[PDB]
């Protein structure tokens, strides 16, 4: 019975050659064995060997540089002496080329929110797929796919990354080489499609509780980012507050303690950091009136012999070292004007004020000072001059 065997004895990955041998039964010496070596892409090497006196055959250094990596199938064929078709096959693996992949960002288009990518491969089959991942600073992901060309290159144009947020973008690309090995590369770049912004507003100043409610909005500020706030009063005193941004970019803080601040204008400033590392800020005006302005005046003494008066008074919500303006008007409209200073405790006095220019009869004392909320705070007192 006619028989043929073939074996693939060696594949030399460096020389890109193979050594084959086989045996025959009932094949005439000097007949030929036809050989094909087929690769993973269907490329064929054709070879021929002669059957020896002992029925054996071999080929050494067969050129397989035309073949691609992956499985090799060897097919041998011959005819026995009576013409019967004989066949056998053998198998091996070729790994003459190291698998590799590169990926590179051509552009991140901040205006269109798109990315152009390109890359190269080695030992990845044309029409192979490259799995592409783009990951943002928040862990959002865009998936994409590209087809490997004849030269092993791949590219994508205008991939939509409008679903990603600003900051570092990581691009990962992966494929499989013809020996079944994962090949991968990554690249990185900056995404800055959204202008960072922050607003702040004074919702309420509760002058009874001496608290403030503050809120605002942000653009391009990451979830849980810290907002630092300052509240500044009319004397330069500062209260600090802090809160965090929500998913919609809003922030709120209720019951901020401003008992340490004095009455008058407030300035609130808020600052956060956007996704591209910029400080974004806003300021807003408020008003504090925890203490009702007041002024009293008293005519303490009229010295009719020296023609003088002693005056005193009290204030509430008048900054110490403010001026108090005092007028003393007599019964015919003559006026004495004086000025003194509000003390640490809000009190003021004038002693030995000369009223020798006034005439006998009624005296009216008027005192005025500016409170911290900008009011003219006044009081009067009445007495008499009897110098003649
Ligand atoms: O209120 C806003 O929307 C933003 N701010 C501008 C924010 N400023 C703050 C500052 O410089 O003090 C610019 C910035 O945040 O750097 C006012 C405006 O431009 O309408
Ligand atoms: Ca290979
Ligand atoms: Ca940005
Ligand atoms: Ca006040
Ligand atoms: Ca008199
Ligand atoms: Cl031969
Ligand atoms: Cl006032
Ligand atoms: Na008078």
Author numbering: 27 to 414
From the paper:
To expand the reach of the ligand-binding domains, RTX adhesins maintain a central extender region of multiple tandem repeats, which makes up most of the proteins’ large molecular weight. In this study, we analyzed extender regions from two additional RTX adhesins, including the long adhesion proteins from Marinobacter hydrocarbonoclasticus (MhLap) – an oil-eating marine bacterium – and Aeromonas hydrophila (AhLap) – an opportunistic pathogen of fish and mammals.
The repeats are rotated relative to each other around the long central axis, producing a handedness to the tetra-tandemers reminiscent of helices. Both the MhLap and AhLap structures show right-handed rotations, with pitches of approximately i + 3 and i + 2, respectively. Regarding Ca2+ coordination, the MhLap tetra-tandemer is once again the simplest of the three. Each calcium in the MhLap tetra-tandemer structure is bound in a similar manner, forming an octahedral coordination sphere comprised of five protein contacts and one water molecule. The protein contacts are made by the sidechains of one asparagine and three aspartate residues, as well as a single backbone carbonyl. Taken together, these spectra demonstrate that the MhLap tetra-tandemer develops into a beta-strand-dominated structure upon Ca2+ addition, although some structure is present in the absence of calcium. The di-tandemer maintained a rod-like structure, with the Bend angle between the two domains never deviating over 30° relative to the start frame; the two domains saw slightly more twisting over the simulation, maintaining a ~ 60° wedge.
